[PDB]
């Protein structure tokens, strides 16, 4: 097992599976969601790519608007 | 700021308004304008989320079968 990589749900130790979650019981903002324990997992070695995930890149601009407008922003005020 | 509000003398200009509003929050993109906690179907950013405050906003028969999966976080909880 590895923190960052491919994976893949297995059969299981008697034939135990994923268990799909029902969509409310939801912990996260998934689209899909799984029931495992350790031992329907499998590192599924040979994929390498790296999948389809986004990436936001953000930036804040701030105005100061207390009697001296050209002081800087504070988060407090 | 209280100069956003274009046709007012030009001494209720300076500082910022403040206090209390009772309305949804909205969001102007360009001429439409929609609330900004509403997913429904358009949108004014995109979405990539299944629930919604409790909502299910998928297409019905939404069940992806999932035989790999990238693993980029670990929380634990």
């Not at chain 2, 304008?33 to 019905?60: C, I, K, N, Q």
């Amino acid at each position: 097992f590895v923190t960052f990589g491919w994976y893949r749900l297995k059969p299981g130790r008697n034939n135990t599976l994923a268990q799909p979650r029902a969509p409310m019981a939801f912990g996260t903002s998934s689209d899909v969601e799984f029931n495992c324990t350790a031992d329907n997992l499998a590192i599924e070695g040979g994929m390498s790519d790296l999948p389809a995930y986004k990436l936001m890149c953000f930036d804040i601009e701030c105005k100061a608007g207390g009697e001296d407008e050209l002081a800087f922003p504070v988060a407090g005020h | 700021p209280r100069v956003l509000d274009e046709d007012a003398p030009p001494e209720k200009r300076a500082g910022v308004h403040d206090g209390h509003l009772k309305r949804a929050p909205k969001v102007y993109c360009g001429g439409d304008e929609r609330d900004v906690l509403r997913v429904g179907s358009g949108g004014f950013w995109p979405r990539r989320s299944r629930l919604w405050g409790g909502v299910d906003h998928a297409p019905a028969g939404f069940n992806p079968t999932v035989t790999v999966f990238h693993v980029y976080d670990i929380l634990e909880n």
